[PDB]
Amino acid sequence: DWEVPPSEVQLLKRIGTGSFGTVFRGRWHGDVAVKVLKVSQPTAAQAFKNEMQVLRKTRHVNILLFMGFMTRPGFAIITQWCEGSSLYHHLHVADTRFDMVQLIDVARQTAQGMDYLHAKNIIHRDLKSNNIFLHEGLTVKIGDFGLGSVLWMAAEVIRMQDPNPYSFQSDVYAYGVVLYELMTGSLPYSHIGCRDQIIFMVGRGYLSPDLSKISSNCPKAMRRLLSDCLKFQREERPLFPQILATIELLQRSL
Amino acid sequence: GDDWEVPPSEVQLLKRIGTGTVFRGRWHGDVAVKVLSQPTAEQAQAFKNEMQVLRKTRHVNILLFMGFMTRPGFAIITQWCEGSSLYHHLHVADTRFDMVQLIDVARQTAQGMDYLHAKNIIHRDLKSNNIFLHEGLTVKIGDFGLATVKSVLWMAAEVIRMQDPNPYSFQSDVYAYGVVLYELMTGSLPYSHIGCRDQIIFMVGRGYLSPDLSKISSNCPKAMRRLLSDCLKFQREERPLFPQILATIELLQRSL
Amino acid sequence: EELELDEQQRKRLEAFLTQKQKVGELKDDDFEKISELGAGNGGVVFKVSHKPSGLVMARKLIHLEIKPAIRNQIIRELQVLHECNSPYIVGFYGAFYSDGEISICMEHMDGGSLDQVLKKAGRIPEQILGKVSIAVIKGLTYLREKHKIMHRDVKPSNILVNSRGEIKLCDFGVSGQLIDAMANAFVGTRSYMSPERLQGTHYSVQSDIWSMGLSLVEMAVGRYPIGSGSMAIFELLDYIVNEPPPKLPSGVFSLEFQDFVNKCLIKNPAERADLKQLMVHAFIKRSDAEEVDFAGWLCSTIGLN
Amino acid sequence: DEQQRKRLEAFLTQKQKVGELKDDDFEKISELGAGNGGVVFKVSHKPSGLVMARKLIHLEIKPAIRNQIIRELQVLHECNSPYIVGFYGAFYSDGEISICMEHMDGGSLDQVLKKAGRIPEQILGKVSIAVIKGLTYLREKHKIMHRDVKPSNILVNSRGEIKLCDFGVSGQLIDAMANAFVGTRSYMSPERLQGTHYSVQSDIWSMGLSLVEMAVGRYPIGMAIFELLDYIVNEPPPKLPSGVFSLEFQDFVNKCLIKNPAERADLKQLMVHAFIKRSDAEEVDFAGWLC
Ligand SMILES: CNS(=O)(=O)Nc1nccc(Cc2c(C)c3ccc(Oc4ncccc4F)cc3oc2=O)c1F
Ligand SMILES: CNS(=O)(=O)Nc1nccc(Cc2c(C)c3ccc(Oc4ncccc4F)cc3oc2=O)c1F
Ligand SMILES: Nc1ncnc2c1ncn2[C@@H]1O[C@H](COP(=O)(O)OP(=O)(O)NP(=O)(O)O)[C@@H](O)[C@H]1O
Ligand SMILES: Nc1ncnc2c1ncn2[C@@H]1O[C@H](COP(=O)(O)OP(=O)(O)NP(=O)(O)O)[C@@H](O)[C@H]1O
Ligand SMILES: [Mg+2]
Ligand SMILES: [Mg+2]
């Protein structure tokens, strides 16, 4: 069993508040991350315990390590503490210098983690560069899965009309935007100031990331893989077994 | 439980690493595959334990269990660690380690052991060979084939005697951790000149022989020597547990 | 002519500027929280006490993961708000960065937003909405004439009132970098956006006029008028662009008020009324002459928050 | 004698065509046994056409310490005796050390004891002679010790030869093999178990305990290994029953299991003991009893 008594956990500095809850750096057999969920009054509860059974299914080096959960006083998730910064921070805040060999490696490790999740029948539903940690400045850690921001949302998720809007392919499109960040060094729609305009256009197909910013140093097979992940029709987007194999075969031919 | 079983069609084996037998393999990336074929009635209960022990471990200082295979034989899949074992770093490659690093490896090893004991896990086989420095930074404790839920160089005397009530305990793990501390602070293995094996067994078991703390390096702090000797004490009742070991290490770390 | 102040307006503005001089530099340790006023898509607002001066302010905290230079430029572009002094614009004390949060300290409005008032009142009376329509038109005109600034976010939650009967605007695009940095947002639930902007035209005050008219309809009937029943943001964004604009019911509201919102909700921005036509419209001319005790209606009939 | 001189010259003739041993030159025939630190396999060396016993020992040691052990055993090239097993070569490769020696088709007496149940006294007399002569050869011609006398290290073959193996020729290999797991049986003299001071007299203790074990077919001390070690140090030694075995053989094991190494017999005294001179006169078909 993975429930942890709240007496065993000491909460330290607040780190930030996301869409799901607030993250604290904590102490429970070493440094840990504790995400305290939004609401305090537990309605129904079992959904939390059901979500925890999804996190219990993950044992992969590219997946953020789930360590335990707390049901009192509120619902909280305990994960490993990542020392370092997110991929969003490295790309858009600190302007860290990465070679193309490193960008494809991050793209490979991210595909390695997503391929594991989908092989375990797990749709991430909220993949983005903020939820990708470069642990030790070396290993990709994907977090906040099976528990978003419009820049990584597919058109069918924006519309919320089609049957099953969240799928493997919606995760693939989110991965495609992460590829866009790695290859261009910037966020999609870099100077479209209206939030609602960005939404309505993408959902209808009128707008899409600008592949002209893709660095010249990016291999042509990566640009094609990127555009395939960004396709408007979800049925035409490749699954991660193909994405991962495409990158792994491309890397062997440096 | 069964959701961790992996079909052999999904797993690829590559280079043999050594001897069961460990292979570097491929299953959603680089992995390690330990092939432990028709199991005897007890070894099935044994594999049921190392897997059940590993299924209860979710900690950065414990080797990441990933799955198991039942065909052609029993096999365990774990993460692939890049680097070498602590035994290799200390007794083979002569790796240059700062004192702050040696204390950090001692801290991380105590961090993983404290997690195991909080889960009522007695590793029963902690040694420098079973401690891996992944990426040269993170301690990963492995080899849970003898672990349980509730060589002789790392064996406590009460375990070597096999007479006292419940020989294997948290304190027997602490002594094994103490010998690992001896390796980190002295750079050598205990009893590194006594040739007679049974002598070591009888002498250590009776108390007539102990690790020679005169080989401790000069840059080892005094608080680390006392923690070393306290973990090596003959009477298991006086050896400290890993919560107290962590508080001692975190104390000496706070001021150089 | 309509950017002019009456004697009470000019006394209150100089009174605010007098209180403002004794403030100075703002720091996090000088603030103590009184109560949380609300939250939005990216920001949370607190009622705070500034200990050195004893002033109560509204402190909006915006979390942004941006480069330090962009952070300094946002703080540097918000200094324009020191020059945005108008009876129809919320005051500004300062802006600073701390703990990953850009903090914007502004004038506290003890009446809250009209989105909060509407939930209490159910429906806001037409005479009250006439004074609201005047303050928005004069507020937008001040931004366009005195600073050539567009609002880009007119909606009930950004129309603030206070116990003295003042109606002021807040949360307008003074910092272009803050507009860009807040575009990386999460999906909303509503939109007061003009169809021409939801499609891609260069920004113009006609969009704000549409947002005002859509707000007037919501506050007049007590229901978000775009959509059906519930709907999601995209489907609502579809209506605005394709379906015809909403309108007030015919029976209760005056023909002047009905024609006022229709000229604001014309979907083509060239035929839509500008800020000069609406200023000399029947509803505005009638409302400006009417004697409406707005401070009494807010304090006595609705309450304060 | 004449037969032993011809067999040693024949072995030296076959040894000249060996040379260097490498991993790729072998094909495994069968697995002979494994122990606390090594496993032995019957192998075929294609370059010379000889069958050998290949002992594999796993050791993760520094490169300098690994090079020392390999040439520390080259002394075995000088250990040519009818009571000592021959030596072909030893080499290291990727963490394990291989030792190639002469194959003994009869195995160890530990394996022969399990098949016979008990070894007759007349056979043990021929065994006692070869162990005393083998130890005397190592002490006078090579001035070392055996350190590990037990039935597992007494090998026999179809031709009736009795030889010894697994003695201390490489001193650091001794210290390296101290890093081993908890054993299953004990054959150490009490003074060896106790402390540092010891001598070749402990080899006489270990064969005395070996003789009693092979005579009654049962490990005579008696449990976990530590309790056995405490028994050797405390309790008096075991002895053969009175009615079955001869008083000469009874007196032989008692003087070989005397706990004090100074009162215990030396290789010079046992050579001229009543039990040794008697069995040397006996004509026993050792090759037939083994085959
Ligand atoms: C939905 N429309 S949109 O998609 O165009 N988004 C945007 N719309 C409009 C503006 C912006 C950015 C913005 C924000 C949000 C802002 C908030 C408070 C603020 O303090 C005060 N405000 C007024 C008076 C006194 C003050 F102290 C200044 C601000 O200045 C700003 O620039 C947007 F992102
Ligand atoms: C419980 N006894 S103890 O505690 O005293 N330890 C020890 N006792 C005895 C020895 C050692 C180490 C050792 C061993 C084991 C060894 C084995 C084989 C070998 O090759 C041949 N040998 C003889 C004939 C033919 C050969 F091919 C050389 C060896 O050389 C060695 O030195 C010990 F560690
Ligand atoms: N395991 C972790 N180790 C270290 N920092 C973490 C960890 N998980 C989250 N954080 C940090 O905690 C803060 C808030 O995270 P979070 O609550 O996930 O918001 P978010 O990731 O930005 N958006 P979302 O994931 O959709 O809720 C960020 O600064 C993260 O970098
Ligand atoms: N100066 C102020 N005085 C009093 N209440 C305020 C003030 N500013 C904001 N509020 C309240 O704080 C609430 C939340 O503010 P805010 O974060 O701006 O939400 P929002 O306006 O709906 N989103 P946005 O588009 O950024 O304006 C509003 O609904 C108001 O009731
Ligand atoms: Mg996150
Ligand atoms: Mg607002």
PDB file of C-alpha atoms in Angstrom, chain C residues 58-201:
ATOM      1  CA  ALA C  58      -5.751  45.992  -4.138  1.00  0.00           C
ATOM      2  CA  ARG C  59      -2.755  43.764  -4.892  1.00  0.00           C
ATOM      3  CA  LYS C  60      -2.983  41.686  -8.070  1.00  0.00           C
ATOM      4  CA  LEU C  61      -0.400  38.891  -8.291  1.00  0.00           C
ATOM      5  CA  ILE C  62       0.416  37.550 -11.764  1.00  0.00           C
ATOM      6  CA  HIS C  63       2.615  34.457 -12.027  1.00  0.00           C
ATOM      7  CA  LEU C  64       4.825  34.457 -15.126  1.00  0.00           C
ATOM      8  CA  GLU C  65       7.827  32.302 -16.048  1.00  0.00           C
ATOM      9  CA  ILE C  66       9.677  34.815 -18.231  1.00  0.00           C
ATOM     10  CA  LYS C  67      13.199  36.086 -18.781  1.00  0.00           C
ATOM     11  CA  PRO C  68      14.453  38.676 -16.257  1.00  0.00           C
ATOM     12  CA  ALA C  69      14.659  41.317 -19.000  1.00  0.00           C
ATOM     13  CA  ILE C  70      11.016  40.826 -20.008  1.00  0.00           C
ATOM     14  CA  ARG C  71      10.108  41.034 -16.317  1.00  0.00           C
ATOM     15  CA  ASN C  72      11.939  44.355 -15.984  1.00  0.00           C
ATOM     16  CA  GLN C  73      10.317  45.643 -19.180  1.00  0.00           C
ATOM     17  CA  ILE C  74       6.832  44.763 -17.903  1.00  0.00           C
ATOM     18  CA  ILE C  75       7.520  46.656 -14.670  1.00  0.00           C
ATOM     19  CA  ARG C  76       8.962  49.475 -16.781  1.00  0.00           C
ATOM     20  CA  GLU C  77       5.906  49.644 -19.064  1.00  0.00           C
ATOM     21  CA  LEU C  78       3.460  49.676 -16.133  1.00  0.00           C
ATOM     22  CA  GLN C  79       4.919  53.022 -15.008  1.00  0.00           C
ATOM     23  CA  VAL C  80       2.665  54.586 -17.662  1.00  0.00           C
ATOM     24  CA  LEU C  81      -0.209  53.995 -15.223  1.00  0.00           C
ATOM     25  CA  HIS C  82       1.190  56.823 -13.079  1.00  0.00           C
ATOM     26  CA  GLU C  83      -0.089  59.134 -15.839  1.00  0.00           C
ATOM     27  CA  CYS C  84      -3.508  57.432 -16.170  1.00  0.00           C
ATOM     28  CA  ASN C  85      -5.366  59.686 -13.729  1.00  0.00           C
ATOM     29  CA  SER C  86      -9.082  59.854 -14.534  1.00  0.00           C
ATOM     30  CA  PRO C  87     -12.341  59.515 -12.567  1.00  0.00           C
ATOM     31  CA  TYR C  88     -13.157  56.537 -14.837  1.00  0.00           C
ATOM     32  CA  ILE C  89      -9.801  54.737 -14.448  1.00  0.00           C
ATOM     33  CA  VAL C  90      -8.615  52.799 -11.400  1.00  0.00           C
ATOM     34  CA  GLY C  91      -5.626  54.360  -9.666  1.00  0.00           C
ATOM     35  CA  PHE C  92      -2.135  52.889  -9.614  1.00  0.00           C
ATOM     36  CA  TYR C  93       0.442  52.860  -6.811  1.00  0.00           C
ATOM     37  CA  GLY C  94       3.242  50.680  -8.172  1.00  0.00           C
ATOM     38  CA  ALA C  95       4.342  47.342  -9.557  1.00  0.00           C
ATOM     39  CA  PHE C  96       7.137  45.052  -8.397  1.00  0.00           C
ATOM     40  CA  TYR C  97       8.419  41.497  -8.789  1.00  0.00           C
ATOM     41  CA  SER C  98       8.856  39.033  -5.923  1.00  0.00           C
ATOM     42  CA  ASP C  99       8.847  35.218  -5.617  1.00  0.00           C
ATOM     43  CA  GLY C 100       8.041  34.667  -9.282  1.00  0.00           C
ATOM     44  CA  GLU C 101       5.032  36.995  -8.985  1.00  0.00           C
ATOM     45  CA  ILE C 102       4.631  40.384 -10.640  1.00  0.00           C
ATOM     46  CA  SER C 103       2.620  42.353  -8.076  1.00  0.00           C
ATOM     47  CA  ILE C 104       0.419  45.218  -9.287  1.00  0.00           C
ATOM     48  CA  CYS C 105      -0.792  47.483  -6.470  1.00  0.00           C
ATOM     49  CA  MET C 106      -3.788  49.630  -7.403  1.00  0.00           C
ATOM     50  CA  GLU C 107      -6.686  51.598  -5.942  1.00  0.00           C
ATOM     51  CA  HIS C 108      -9.014  49.491  -3.801  1.00  0.00           C
ATOM     52  CA  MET C 109     -12.692  49.589  -4.811  1.00  0.00           C
ATOM     53  CA  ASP C 110     -14.859  48.542  -1.864  1.00  0.00           C
ATOM     54  CA  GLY C 111     -17.848  47.844  -4.127  1.00  0.00           C
ATOM     55  CA  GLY C 112     -16.019  45.234  -6.169  1.00  0.00           C
ATOM     56  CA  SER C 113     -16.734  44.388  -9.789  1.00  0.00           C
ATOM     57  CA  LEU C 114     -20.100  44.552 -11.521  1.00  0.00           C
ATOM     58  CA  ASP C 115     -19.775  40.805 -12.116  1.00  0.00           C
ATOM     59  CA  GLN C 116     -19.994  40.447  -8.327  1.00  0.00           C
ATOM     60  CA  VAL C 117     -22.759  43.057  -8.088  1.00  0.00           C
ATOM     61  CA  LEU C 118     -24.766  41.298 -10.806  1.00  0.00           C
ATOM     62  CA  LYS C 119     -24.701  38.037  -8.844  1.00  0.00           C
ATOM     63  CA  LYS C 120     -26.144  39.921  -5.860  1.00  0.00           C
ATOM     64  CA  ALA C 121     -28.608  42.105  -7.776  1.00  0.00           C
ATOM     65  CA  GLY C 122     -29.647  39.432 -10.271  1.00  0.00           C
ATOM     66  CA  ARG C 123     -30.219  42.248 -12.757  1.00  0.00           C
ATOM     67  CA  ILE C 124     -28.695  45.729 -12.829  1.00  0.00           C
ATOM     68  CA  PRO C 125     -31.318  48.434 -13.511  1.00  0.00           C
ATOM     69  CA  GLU C 126     -31.275  50.389 -16.754  1.00  0.00           C
ATOM     70  CA  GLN C 127     -30.722  53.729 -15.007  1.00  0.00           C
ATOM     71  CA  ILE C 128     -27.670  52.227 -13.301  1.00  0.00           C
ATOM     72  CA  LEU C 129     -26.472  50.799 -16.624  1.00  0.00           C
ATOM     73  CA  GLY C 130     -26.792  54.265 -18.157  1.00  0.00           C
ATOM     74  CA  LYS C 131     -24.264  55.649 -15.688  1.00  0.00           C
ATOM     75  CA  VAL C 132     -22.174  52.530 -16.342  1.00  0.00           C
ATOM     76  CA  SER C 133     -22.304  53.108 -20.104  1.00  0.00           C
ATOM     77  CA  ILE C 134     -21.182  56.716 -19.590  1.00  0.00           C
ATOM     78  CA  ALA C 135     -18.182  55.801 -17.430  1.00  0.00           C
ATOM     79  CA  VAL C 136     -16.990  53.156 -19.900  1.00  0.00           C
ATOM     80  CA  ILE C 137     -17.271  55.523 -22.877  1.00  0.00           C
ATOM     81  CA  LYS C 138     -15.464  58.305 -21.013  1.00  0.00           C
ATOM     82  CA  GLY C 139     -12.907  55.829 -19.678  1.00  0.00           C
ATOM     83  CA  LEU C 140     -12.107  54.450 -23.129  1.00  0.00           C
ATOM     84  CA  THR C 141     -11.961  57.975 -24.569  1.00  0.00           C
ATOM     85  CA  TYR C 142      -9.442  59.011 -21.909  1.00  0.00           C
ATOM     86  CA  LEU C 143      -7.252  56.007 -22.733  1.00  0.00           C
ATOM     87  CA  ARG C 144      -7.411  56.723 -26.472  1.00  0.00           C
ATOM     88  CA  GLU C 145      -7.043  60.516 -26.354  1.00  0.00           C
ATOM     89  CA  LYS C 146      -4.612  60.984 -23.459  1.00  0.00           C
ATOM     90  CA  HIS C 147      -2.448  57.879 -23.980  1.00  0.00           C
ATOM     91  CA  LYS C 148      -3.600  56.248 -27.267  1.00  0.00           C
ATOM     92  CA  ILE C 149      -4.193  53.021 -25.336  1.00  0.00           C
ATOM     93  CA  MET C 150      -6.840  50.395 -26.104  1.00  0.00           C
ATOM     94  CA  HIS C 151      -8.505  48.413 -23.326  1.00  0.00           C
ATOM     95  CA  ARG C 152      -8.689  44.928 -24.945  1.00  0.00           C
ATOM     96  CA  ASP C 153     -10.485  43.415 -21.933  1.00  0.00           C
ATOM     97  CA  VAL C 154     -13.790  45.201 -21.243  1.00  0.00           C
ATOM     98  CA  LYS C 155     -16.124  42.968 -19.243  1.00  0.00           C
ATOM     99  CA  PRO C 156     -18.126  43.164 -15.988  1.00  0.00           C
ATOM    100  CA  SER C 157     -15.265  41.798 -13.872  1.00  0.00           C
ATOM    101  CA  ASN C 158     -13.121  44.759 -15.020  1.00  0.00           C
ATOM    102  CA  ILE C 159     -15.724  47.448 -14.245  1.00  0.00           C
ATOM    103  CA  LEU C 160     -15.203  48.411 -10.604  1.00  0.00           C
ATOM    104  CA  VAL C 161     -17.422  50.496  -8.321  1.00  0.00           C
ATOM    105  CA  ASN C 162     -17.048  51.963  -4.842  1.00  0.00           C
ATOM    106  CA  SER C 163     -19.186  53.373  -2.039  1.00  0.00           C
ATOM    107  CA  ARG C 164     -18.650  56.947  -3.273  1.00  0.00           C
ATOM    108  CA  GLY C 165     -20.529  56.044  -6.465  1.00  0.00           C
ATOM    109  CA  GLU C 166     -17.460  56.014  -8.717  1.00  0.00           C
ATOM    110  CA  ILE C 167     -17.362  53.718 -11.758  1.00  0.00           C
ATOM    111  CA  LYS C 168     -13.858  52.938 -13.005  1.00  0.00           C
ATOM    112  CA  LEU C 169     -12.069  50.694 -15.498  1.00  0.00           C
ATOM    113  CA  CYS C 170      -9.171  48.348 -14.790  1.00  0.00           C
ATOM    114  CA  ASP C 171      -7.073  45.608 -16.409  1.00  0.00           C
ATOM    115  CA  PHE C 172      -6.354  47.263 -19.752  1.00  0.00           C
ATOM    116  CA  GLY C 173      -3.427  46.673 -22.078  1.00  0.00           C
ATOM    117  CA  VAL C 174      -0.864  49.196 -20.880  1.00  0.00           C
ATOM    118  CA  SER C 175       2.087  46.763 -21.185  1.00  0.00           C
ATOM    119  CA  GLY C 176       2.421  45.026 -24.541  1.00  0.00           C
ATOM    120  CA  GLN C 177       4.828  42.503 -23.030  1.00  0.00           C
ATOM    121  CA  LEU C 178       2.341  41.609 -20.287  1.00  0.00           C
ATOM    122  CA  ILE C 179      -0.242  41.063 -23.035  1.00  0.00           C
ATOM    123  CA  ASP C 180       2.109  38.647 -24.811  1.00  0.00           C
ATOM    124  CA  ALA C 181       3.253  36.879 -21.637  1.00  0.00           C
ATOM    125  CA  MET C 182      -0.375  36.353 -20.577  1.00  0.00           C
ATOM    126  CA  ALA C 183      -1.331  34.892 -23.964  1.00  0.00           C
ATOM    127  CA  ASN C 184       0.195  31.582 -22.824  1.00  0.00           C
ATOM    128  CA  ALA C 185      -2.899  30.982 -20.716  1.00  0.00           C
ATOM    129  CA  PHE C 186      -5.422  28.263 -19.929  1.00  0.00           C
ATOM    130  CA  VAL C 187      -8.740  27.853 -21.721  1.00  0.00           C
ATOM    131  CA  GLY C 188     -11.415  30.214 -20.447  1.00  0.00           C
ATOM    132  CA  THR C 189     -15.135  29.691 -20.008  1.00  0.00           C
ATOM    133  CA  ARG C 190     -16.511  32.889 -21.585  1.00  0.00           C
ATOM    134  CA  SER C 191     -15.511  35.572 -24.057  1.00  0.00           C
ATOM    135  CA  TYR C 192     -16.518  39.201 -24.583  1.00  0.00           C
ATOM    136  CA  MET C 193     -14.340  39.358 -27.688  1.00  0.00           C
ATOM    137  CA  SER C 194     -15.434  40.943 -30.946  1.00  0.00           C
ATOM    138  CA  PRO C 195     -15.784  38.631 -33.973  1.00  0.00           C
ATOM    139  CA  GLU C 196     -13.329  40.749 -35.972  1.00  0.00           C
ATOM    140  CA  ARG C 197     -10.683  40.169 -33.285  1.00  0.00           C
ATOM    141  CA  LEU C 198     -11.517  36.458 -32.994  1.00  0.00           C
ATOM    142  CA  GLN C 199     -10.571  36.352 -36.701  1.00  0.00           C
ATOM    143  CA  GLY C 200      -7.446  38.506 -36.916  1.00  0.00           C
ATOM    144  CA  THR C 201      -7.909  42.235 -37.483  1.00  0.00           C
TER     145      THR C 201
END
